[PDB]
Amino acid sequence: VNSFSGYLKLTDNVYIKNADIVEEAKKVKPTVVVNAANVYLKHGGGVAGALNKATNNAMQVESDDYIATNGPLKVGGSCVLSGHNLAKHCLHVVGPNVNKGEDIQLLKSAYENFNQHEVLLAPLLSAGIFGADPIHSLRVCVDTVRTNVYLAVFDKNLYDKLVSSFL
């Protein structure tokens, strides 16, 4: 039993809710919140900008030190950093950004990072300003992630479309 509330169950292990991931993280304080990161961990907008803003820029300060030491992530890769005031940990995952021409097949590799964590609060990878089709992202999530994932979808309209079209 966990503390996530109001989710619709899509499969054995995937759940979905119309929610603001920042507010959801602030209430649940999950072990892991997933960030929709880029390879430079520059959290300027979308989910990343909102998560970082909620940490009063502490996420960005920590991220800049990580990059200075380790260099950029790979598209499809991830790193575990602090969750600050939002979660115990933040799993920064880089889905492909269609608006940069990155290969959509890397979306499966990106979701594989979730399997290293038993339970996660997450957005749909490569959705929003990353330019991929969110219905496709949900399909890849369901077909790739085997651990327990609670998906927060900010836009109520998109949420309804994702549920109604789910196979």
Ligand SMILES: CS(=O)(=O)[C@@H]1CCCN(c2ncnc3[nH]c4cc(F)ccc4c23)C1
């Ligand atoms: C590539 S993206 O991350 O922008 C993708 C596109 C749609 C919006 N995104 C979110 N999904 C879940 N919760 C969210 N809170 C947010 C707060 C914001 F100020 C902006 C986006 C989100 C958000 C997912």
